[PDB]
Design a protein around this ligand. Sequence first.
Ligand SMILES: CCCCCCCO[C@H]1O[C@H](CO)[C@@H](O)C[C@@H]1O
Length: 158
Amino acid sequence: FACKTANGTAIPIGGGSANVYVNLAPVVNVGQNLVVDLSTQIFCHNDYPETITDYVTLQRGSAYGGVLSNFSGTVKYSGSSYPFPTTSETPRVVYNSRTDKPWPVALYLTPVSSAGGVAIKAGSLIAVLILRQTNNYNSDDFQFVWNIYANNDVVVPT
Ligand SMILES: CCCCCCCO[C@H]1O[C@H](CO)[C@@H](O)C[C@@H]1O
């Protein structure tokens, strides 16, 4: 089991960490959602599907900078919604193919009432998402740490 980003940055067998740079909607009004869809950015595969079934969870999701300060978040994992920053590990997603399959994570961030102006700064850390991978074969338990960075400023109109 290993993962890679849309630009080819990889995390090999045994886990580790990688930076993900995301393009964000430039304008988000109060009452609207800023969608950070990581399913188009993070892809994983099973290296031995003939014998092993891999299990993948979103172990934890943390918010930073402008996202922590100016937004109220929700994380959608494989069709279900949870608070963001996260309060529990999600259920498991099965990886049973060598074909690169998306990690089904998407953040839904709506501005808090105090938000106005530049709510997210270009180049800043916005989130840390921990992918936890286990299997039905041995005691392998690995963390794939995704550091999410904003590629651009996000303005909340006033
Ligand atoms: C002859 C037996 C060969 C055993 C090969 C072990 C491969 O382990 C990796 O791939 C697995 C499947 O994706 C992951 O559950 C854990 C490791 O990432």
